Amino acid sequence: DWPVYHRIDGPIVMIGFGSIGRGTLPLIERHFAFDRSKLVVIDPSDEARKLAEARGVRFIQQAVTRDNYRELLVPLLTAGPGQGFCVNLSVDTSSLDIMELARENGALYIDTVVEPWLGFYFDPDLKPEARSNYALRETVLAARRNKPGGTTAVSCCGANPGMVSWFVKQALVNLAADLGVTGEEPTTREEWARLAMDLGVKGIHIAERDTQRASFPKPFDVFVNTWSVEGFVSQGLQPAELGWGTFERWMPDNARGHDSGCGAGIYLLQPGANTRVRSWTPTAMAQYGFLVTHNESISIADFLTVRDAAGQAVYRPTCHYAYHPCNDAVLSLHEMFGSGKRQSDWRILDETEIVDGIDELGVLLYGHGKNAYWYGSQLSIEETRRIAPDQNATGLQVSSAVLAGMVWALENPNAGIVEADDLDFRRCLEVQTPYLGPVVGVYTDWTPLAGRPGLFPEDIDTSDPWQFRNVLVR
Amino acid sequence: DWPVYHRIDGPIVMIGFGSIGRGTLPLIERHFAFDRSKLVVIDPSDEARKLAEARGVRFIQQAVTRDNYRELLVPLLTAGPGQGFCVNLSVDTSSLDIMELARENGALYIDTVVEPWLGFYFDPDLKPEARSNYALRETVLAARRNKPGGTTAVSCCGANPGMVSWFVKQALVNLAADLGVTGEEPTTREEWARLAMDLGVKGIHIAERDTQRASFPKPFDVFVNTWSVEGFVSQGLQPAELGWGTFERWMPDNARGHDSGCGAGIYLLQPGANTRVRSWTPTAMAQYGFLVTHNESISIADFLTVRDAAGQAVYRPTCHYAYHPCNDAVLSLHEMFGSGKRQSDWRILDETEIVDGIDELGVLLYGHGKNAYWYGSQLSIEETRRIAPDQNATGLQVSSAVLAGMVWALENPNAGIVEADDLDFRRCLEVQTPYLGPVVGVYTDWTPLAGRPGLFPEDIDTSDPWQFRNVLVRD
Ligand SMILES: NC(=O)c1ccc[n+]([C@@H]2O[C@H](COP(=O)([O-])OP(=O)(O)OC[C@H]3O[C@@H](n4cnc5c(N)ncnc54)[C@H](O)[C@@H]3O)[C@@H](O)[C@H]2O)c1
Ligand SMILES: NC(=O)c1ccc[n+]([C@@H]2O[C@H](COP(=O)([O-])OP(=O)(O)OC[C@H]3O[C@@H](n4cnc5c(N)ncnc54)[C@H](O)[C@@H]3O)[C@@H](O)[C@H]2O)c1
Ligand SMILES: N=C(N)NCCCCN
Ligand SMILES: N=C(N)NCCCCN
């Protein structure tokens, strides 16, 4: 039967019961030992409440806010007898403030995004840079500098951000092995960064193609997605953002850097979900992705930075999302940006509605001797239904990553604030892999200059096909 | 019963029997008197042959080419008795050369595009300007100057180009009434141009939203459309192109003009089907369209040009396509441009496959005192099936326009080379309207600056909402 990894000796407080919470609950019940009454779900939605009642779990129908979060969460997380676990799978709540609360009270914490309190993503008084994921991530890095060590809190441990950091490590090890490079694999951050440098990895796309589709066609004036519509639209309206490689020799006129922080990012003064990049996955082959901002774009580039003695970066890979969502989501974006406003309604595709498809999600390492290598999951909806309830393929990649991060945090409970890049990738993938379907590594000779230039003048760099100059659709 | 407008006494030579030929043949049989044996269909495909054989129509399985077109077509066009009609609904053939051949042999001619001989659209040695529809159209204008008058040949008389020119005239008449502009209805080009100027029409979108969809979802690595995939892709890869208004204050850095010709156009050094514009239709409300080059973008702007005594244009509207095709075609474009190459396969959706939807096709006149006015057809697939066989709603708007053009040509057979802008719009719409479903005019307060600027700095002109600077989507 299914492995039971650990006993949780305290309350399990799940904040949010949308597509991810719904997928994560059965894995928590499956894989951890605890008295049933220890677990409670918090979400303001009526739809969520009804589902939770049907699953027999405690449910508190309340929005967690800046005004109530201490009065609500401190008692729930300290109910006893021992260490609890805050599993934060929400929108509209501050990941930073909830994480700090959990740590102050000795509760473990995990989330899948650095989310702000409601009001931030569309605050008109905020400059674009202040709305960036780089800025949000810097709040977490500052919190870690202020309070090193202490109770483990795992930031951004879903599928992407999350699992894809483990895929980057596995891909680096595979690339070295395929080149005939043997020996002890890296154990420190500096060793990982040097491995990427040494192998000549110029950059990395988080290269995703979701082919799930429903039994009904996309409705007019309805945004359709396979996971959070609210969350996808919010990140899609944030600036396009990327980890910025030392090899890059060009950026657009509307690109900007940061005066402070880890140093690894740029952003563009335009929305990421209306920015296209040329990319590739095994099933899609050459495709457009959307350059939607994501925590891992910054965290992976930061993690893989090599500095000189003076502290200047001498190597860092480019890293960004290149997302091709499901076809109905592609149409939803065309509709939303074309109208200039959010649709009147939205819906997240349920497994009962999906006729076929996969969520092909991996990392595309490029610029090395073998040109490009994609490593990741090809999980299908059919396999998903066989192995986990209450979710589609997109959901299961995320919920299984939360499971893996929870196992890691319980196993390493005194590690302080950590990102997915800081965890034991082998252990996390050992836990996650039963839920990932085919996990494969594929080389390709494709580059962003394939077939170019065409019949119009193009500003390309033929000396270096993987330059962002050639990737960005301009 | 259906009106039989005229007898056709000579050969009816249909070149091409794809989606539009299949929709047009039944209308020709319905609306003209003639012995069926006088019809001949020419198409290289086996698919077309079997369909033509099923209709008991004479078929020649040949590609018309620069090498064979004279030897092949002249005996067909001149078989008699009396005047033939060449109905050209093909791809890969020279509209100009075939039209000139028809005229020199006294046969009427109609087409729906200025198509070049196979090889042109992807010729790597062609300068971008030479790939433009402005350039192709100038070959037709030059032919007209060289041989004025004579046998009628109707260039670009489908739905768009074609019908939409008639919608522009009707829309101008309606705007004049609604804005209180008095005067007799224009009866000359110069008078139409002056009316557009007096009404303050800054520009015109050919504003289209196709909502047809099939019983199956879009297959991977298949381009899906409701009409010619080959044709749509070819025009989509031509430069983005537009008739250029005198009111415009800005053009992109990669815009270019023309040193010669009618003077009405610019083009952009990028493909039109990967160029977006902000536009609007009644059912879509605000939407993106693709800035795909079309003959009418140039022909309507040219027709509505006012010149001073020196010959300099003092007024001309902007005019261009703002096309939102069916959802499966939107996905097909994302796939094609994302991969950098044509899909391995394609299909045109048949009426038997389409579950619901309309082809909402009209003209959006903007900049006047009531902001913007859309006039056009909202034909549904359900209505299409009730009234005409072998086609979807896209096809029927086109085939019925060809029908209207044929009736006009038979009634005016010595008018020389003409575009849809030159035809009697009322007579043409009288013939076509039974096939157009709801034809409506709708005002809107929407403008391209609605909701802007938003969260990011935008390069907009806040002084004039309808400036191209505000319409063009700038990656
Ligand atoms: N790292 C990844 O791979 C990844 C993947 C998917 C989702 N996510 C993120 O996970 C989160 C959940 O995604 P989802 O698909 O479940 O979204 P969802 O939109 O389906 O559900 C969000 C849920 O949060 C709720 N909620 C709203 N306000 C709340 C509040 N004040 N307090 C508590 N709950 C509140 C909704 O009622 C709701 O049910 C999103 O933030 C998201 O961006 C991360
Ligand atoms: N003005 C408008 O509104 C409008 C609308 C639709 C189509 N069109 C145009 O009409 C034409 C036909 O469109 P469609 O949807 O029927 O296209 P289609 O792709 O369905 O059919 C084209 C047909 O031409 C044929 N053909 C190819 N090479 C030929 C040759 N050398 N000689 C003769 N025939 C040849 C194919 O075998 C074929 O059946 C296209 O050029 C097009 O762009 C205009
Ligand atoms: N992952 C990084 N960018 N730095 C390492 C952080 C180490 C936290 N203990
Ligand atoms: N329609 C124009 N642009 N000019 C008028 C041409 C008239 C041809 N008889």
Residue numbers in the entry:
A (entry chain A): 3 to 476
B (entry chain B): 3 to 477
Provide the authors' original text about this structure.
Residue Glu-298 has been chosen based on direct interaction with the active site residue His-296, forming a Glu-His-Glu triad together with Glu-237. All four variants of BvHSS lead to enzymatically inactive but soluble enzymes. Other than minimal and most likely negligible rotations of the side chain amide group of amino acid Gln-237 and the side chain of amino acid His-296, no structural changes of active site residues compared with wild-type BvHSS were observed. The exchange of residue Glu-237 by Gln-237 resulted in changes of the electrostatic potential of the surface of the binding pocket. Compared with wild-type BvHSS, because of the change of the pKa value the side chain of His-296 (pKa,calc = 6.4) should no longer be protonated at both nitrogens resulting in a loss of the positive charge at the imidazole ring. Together with the loss of the negative charge of the side chain of residue 237 because of the replacement of glutamate by glutamine, the electrostatic potential of the surface of the pocket inverted at pH 7 and pH 9, at a region around Gln-237, to a now positive electrostatic potential and, at an area around His-296, to a negative electrostatic potential. Of note, the structure of BvHSS variant E237Q does not have PUT bound at the active site neither at the outer nor at the inner binding site. This implies an important role for the residue Glu-237 during substrate binding. Under the assumption that the change of Glu-237 to Gln-237 mimics the electrostatic potential of a fully substrate bound state, the observed rigid and narrow conformation of the pore of the binding pocket supports the concept that it functions as a locking mechanism directed through a substrate-sensing feature of the “track-and-trace” loop. All BvHSS and BvHSS variants co-crystallized with AGM were found to have AGM bound to the protein surface at various sites, most likely causing the observed improvement in crystal growth.
